[model samples]
Target: AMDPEFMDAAIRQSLAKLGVQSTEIQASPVAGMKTVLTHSGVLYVTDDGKHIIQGPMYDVSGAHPVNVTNKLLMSQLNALEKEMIVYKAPDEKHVITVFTDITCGYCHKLHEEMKDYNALGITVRYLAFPRQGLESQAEQDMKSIWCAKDKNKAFDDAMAGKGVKPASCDVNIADHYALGVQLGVSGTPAIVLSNGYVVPGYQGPKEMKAFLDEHQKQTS
Candidate 1:
């Protein structure tokens, strides 16, 4: 193994030669190497930057799913969970968090059909990840939703693209976008299960149930 800074510098140089750009390099699920999150996706490199591993690598030493993948640890997911507006099921069998924007077409579909998700014993939690960051109307609407007396209903109205009235506060708005980026979300409706699966895009009730059930079946 080499000094991590030197390894990172070396890898940056190697990527420069190949014209592949990377951001946020961290210790991988392996020794003598680092996990390089790039503009494309995840890749791995040796400390010397002479060897590169594509796809995924197993981390047998870390805790739980973090041992299987460096993508998202349960702790990281839980951190995001704390700031979200949750719709809990009466008998929740699973919890899924989503980074969403009201303006996204699929996000609207997911919101409009909320009863289905609740009925399936899935607790759905939402964090604001405005597609245009803090520059768009959706950002303001999100703040309004957060500030509303009835947050759940406010969220419902906004997600329907019906607009939320001006309600403002100095909550963790910037942090929301940062959380999405950290979780590898480039678009709206990034759904994350508790098992460290941060899946991007809309997954309806039945689809999510099947996938989540299959997931726990194996975890059992």
Candidate 2:
């Protein structure tokens, strides 16, 4: 194996050539593999910096397969936590982050049932992921929501189909959209559990709670 610094620098250079920005380069749980955290997503590099692996890797030694890919995704999501809009659950049994768009009907349905989800002890955090990409009306609306004096109220109104009251601030909706892409959020209302398990679409309060209950037991 090459020296750690050599591996890091070499791989970073290789990644740069492909127009990727490398953030962290560290050895992975898999022997002879180094996980490279990049602006777009995570990639695995050979110990000697000779090859790159671009998919999920699992550690099946446990009773169930543990997704090493999701672990990294969780870390990336954590980095964006402070930037997300949150709805508090009174009981707070579990927390889920969702990539949402104002134009998505299912996202509105989820927002409309926010109280029920809260009643079920599930806190919801929202990240902007405009389905039509940036520079669209949805993106502008999302910016207004994130930039309003009362973001919660702004979000509620937006989800309720109220016309967007244009607002501006130092918010970066682009980063949120980019992270959503990196996290493989293809559509709106992409729910991410605290443990990094993603539910790709809308789930009502009952169904949402059931999934959370099962996931809690699985992680426990």
Candidate 3:
């Protein structure tokens, strides 16, 4: 077993290399465990604090793949999803949940095609993923839109890159970001299907229509 003091120093050192500050790190109730909130996701640290593990740690040698870090960041994301603010398209037919950041080029491109998506009877539900979390202008912009009295109008304004009046409200942008982290969303425009499968990156309206059609047939 590693000495507690040595372990603590090791953890701090490792975190420093990872550009994580003390405030950004959270410690689990169990001893010798630590979690760092990085842009990618929450990172797991060993008890000795000397080692940091990214993504889901798995035991491939087993007959079945055993994910060791099941109790980490993913759990946090799942819990946060319940609290996220969702914007539903009018005349809902098919529901597709999307994690979007306003500043991303592809996210903006997707927004530009919102009308086409709506025409296809796909209700594109948007969930915020500020990308830079609370520290970004994108987060502020999203907050403004969500707080607007008319969400549809606000959404249009945002898609057009027009400025919106800043308003404070009990929006779930933070929760949405947390959900994005939990869902392993590394970039903007991550699309989640009704069956719980996630497709990362962008898909244009035409491709999206085909994808949804095929999915509907399979599910039906």
Candidate 4:
């Protein structure tokens, strides 16, 4: 018999080491296991509550294998739309939300190439994900950048190693960082395409445009 309550309890016990709590435990398609939702990711636990699995999940039987977990996480990402810093394309055709760190090398490289991205009609949006926790200098830098009157300029300056001007607001950067955790964004430059697929790591503007084009075709 599947007992999600027990499964939740057991999974919560295991996650205590990582300071995570489990919720929304329910029987999954996989027999003997139950799905458990947490801020960290969509995970599973044995019905008996002794085993657990973590990482990406998928629906493979369909003609196109869909990353189920990422798509689900998209709802969470979508919920924060109003809080993001964006560089819109005048003729925007697509939006890619990115989890970014102020001091990351590749994050800077991506920002440096934003011109080409916008030129291709791909809008880029950012949410602060200071890889280091709130106490870190990266988080400190991101706070100013997030609340500045000019978010794009502040971000560019901070990414360029130019200090950000002192500023403050309801940016709720801590919430952004927590959202990254839920999305399993362990590193900077994690890009989420419109299809709810999270493409980890940096991509050149041309490659990004191509990916967006192809993805739209498949999704359409």
Candidate 5:
């Protein structure tokens, strides 16, 4: 017999002892399994709280296997919706969340083609993921861009080599940076597609559209 309260507490204690920072914990769809949301990814614990599973759980019953881990990642990603620097499409079809760094060449290239991405009916949203880690110049530049009154313009200016201007705001860029880490974003221009799959590194408009098209087919 599994006690929900006991399982939750036990999982929490186990994670705490292992020094794994978990943000959310809940009962998994499968019997006797507990789902734990961590900074790196999702972890599943047994009812006894003594066993753990780190890999993704797939729904193989269907023709296409669904990545349950990515679905869980979306929940955490969606929580930061309000903080994103958005470049919305006029005929919005899909939205992508990109983890970016100001100093990365690929990130600049992606931003340079923002119009093309938008024209393809793909809305681009940004979240800071400074490649040099926190307190670095890149991180500082992200702070300025994210904090600026005109975030989009500030990002463009920085991307265009105008340099990062000094600015301050109530919003903390660190949170955005942390979320990138949570999502396992290792480099700049990492795009989280509408279907919760991460396309690491730079992707051009047509390539992105191809991915989006495939995503729609699979999801639909």
Candidate 6:
């Protein structure tokens, strides 16, 4: 088991080797395990951060190569979803989770199609992933939205280019950003399908509908 403090130190050292600071790394819960998010993506490190493991480790059975990295990532992603602050549609059907950056054009495009997604029985949930990190205007905008009395309205305004006045309050914005990093969200409009798979980039409504339908059928 990895102790949090030791793990944090190890993360710092690893980042240092890459000419970056440990504070730049974001962490998230992975099946009770803590993982560090780096610029390249998620890395599996020992709890004490002393041993950073690169690539997937797996136990080989009789047939098929089991991808342990993929499993770990999925668990972290699911836990991230559990911790998200949702701005839900009233009559929700299927839930499609998205990692969004307040300043990303594609993220705005996705927001514009919210009604269409809801019409298709899809409930979209937004998780903050300020592409510019925690110190940028994007991060501040997300904080404002999360801190707003009406989260949904605030989100809409932000996406519409209406700047939100900075409001200070205790919220889960940091956790959401860390979760996005752990889940390997390096870009905006990163969509997590209902089945736990990720689809990166700007997927149009038609493609998204087909994708969801196929996923449901396969899972069912």
TM-score of each: 0.70, 0.88, 0.61, 0.81, 0.88, 0.68
Evaluated against the true structure, the overall lDDT of model 2 is 0.81
Candidate 1, 1-220: lDDT as tens digits: 5544666898888877888864557776477878776645456788888888763565445343432342444455576554578899989988888888888888888888789999999999988888875777788778888877777888988776677887777666666775566556779788877765676577889999998897766552
Name the lDDT value of residue 184 in candidate 5.
Answer: 58
Q: Write the per-residue lDDT of candidate 6 for residues 98-121, one digit (tens) a residue.
A: 888878998888889887887777
Instruction: Give the deviation of candidate 1 from the true structure as CA RMSD.
Output: 5.1
Tens digits of lDDT, candidate 4, 1-220: 5643554676667766666654656556677877676756667678765777885667788667777666766776888887788999989988999999877889888999988899999999999988768778888778888888888889888877788887878777877776676566778898988756777678989989888898888862
Candidate 6 or 2, higher lDDT: 2
Error of 1 at 113 (Å): 1.3
List CA RMSD, all candidates. 5.1, 2.7, 6.6, 3.7, 2.8, 5.7
Ranking by lDDT: 2, 5, 4, 1, 3, 6
Give the winner by lDDT. 2
lDDT of each: 0.73, 0.81, 0.68, 0.78, 0.80, 0.67
- Residue-level lDDT of model 5, residues 1-220, one tens digit each, is 5544766778878878888855478667678887777766568888667888884566577677766666666876787787789999999988999988888889989999999999999999998888787788888878878888888889889999998788887667777766665455767788987656778677799999988888878873
Judged by whole-model lDDT over C-alpha atoms, candidate 4 comes out at: 0.78
> Looking at model 2, how many pairs of residues clash?
0
Question: How high a TM-score does candidate 5 get?
Answer: 0.88
Write the number of the candidate with greater TM-score, choosing between 1 and 6: 1
Per-residue lDDT tens digits for candidate 3, residues 1-220, read 4544665577768777767764245665435666555644557787566777664444456454434443344455444444343445567667777888778789889888888888777877777888776767889888888778876678778778787778788775876775566556778898866654466578987898788787666542
lDDT of 5: 0.80
lDDT of 2 by residue, 1-220 (tens): 5544766778878877788864578668888888776656668888676789874577787776766776667877888777678998998998999999888988988988999999999999999998886888899889988988888988988887777788898878987876666566778889988767778588999999999998888773
Lowest summed lDDT window (length 10), candidate 4? 1-10
* Cα error, candidate 6, residue 63 (Å): 13
